[PDB]
């Protein structure tokens, strides 16, 4: 009789997506990436500022 909008009604959101509860529990919307570090090559570094 009436359309309820997901992302605003938690009951409808959970009904549509059963994975929403697990997503909220694990806080997958804010996940820290691996702290890896790589250095660009001197060729690219010089080409960036080569005028």
């Amino acid at each position: 009789v009436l359309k309820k909008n997901p992302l605003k009604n938690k009951q409808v959101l959970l009904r549509l997506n059963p994975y929403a509860k697990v997503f909220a529990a694990e806080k997958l919307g804010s996940k820290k990436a691996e702290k890896t570090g790589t250095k660009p090559a001197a060729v690219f570094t010089e080409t960036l500022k080569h005028d």
Partner: protein
């Protein structure tokens, strides 16, 4: 008054190509035409018997009749808000074969060959053609290909 004849405004249409006048090469008369074959129509100026009209120049049609030296072509002409069939008899000279149909038979033969070979094992035949899909990822290496800086040139007044 006004003039609309059988050969009106065909000065540059019913004209032989440059350095291609004279007789016709003896290859058209050796072509075999059968009922159902798709052929194109291109008028030749040397022969004035059985010449097609201006509208039927460049049109593509099926062969429905075979005669001594002529074939019948069915051409769909758009008059008003409908297409009407036209059965016109033309000489062999002003008619050539169409390579699109031949490419279709070649594709059909390759299609059947792949349907046999691939389905002998039964995995992902994919007999249908696909359009130009977007290019996948690629990596370019600047080993001897260092990008050269380019700048717009100043305006010049060369004569």
């Amino acid at each position: 008054g006004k003039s609309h004849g059988y050969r009106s405004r065909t000065r540059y249409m019913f004209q032989r190509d440059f350095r291609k006048h004279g007789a016709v090469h003896l290859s058209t008369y050796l072509k075999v035409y059968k009922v159902g074959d798709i052929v194109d129509i291109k008028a030749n100026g040397s022969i004035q018997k059985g010449m097609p009209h201006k509208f039927y120049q460049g049109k593509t049609g099926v062969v429905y009749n075979v005669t001594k030296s002529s074939v019948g072509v069915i051409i769909n002409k758009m008059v008003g808000n409908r297409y009407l069939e036209k059965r016109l008899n033309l000489r062999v000279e002003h008619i050539k074969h169409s390579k699109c149909r031949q490419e279709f038979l070649e594709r059909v033969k390759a299609n059947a060959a792949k349907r046999a070979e691939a389905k002998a094992q039964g995995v992902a035949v994919q007999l249908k053609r696909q359009p130009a899909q977007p290019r996948e990822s690629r990596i370019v290496s600047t080993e001897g290909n260092v990008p050269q800086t380019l700048a717009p040139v100043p305006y010049e007044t060369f004569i």
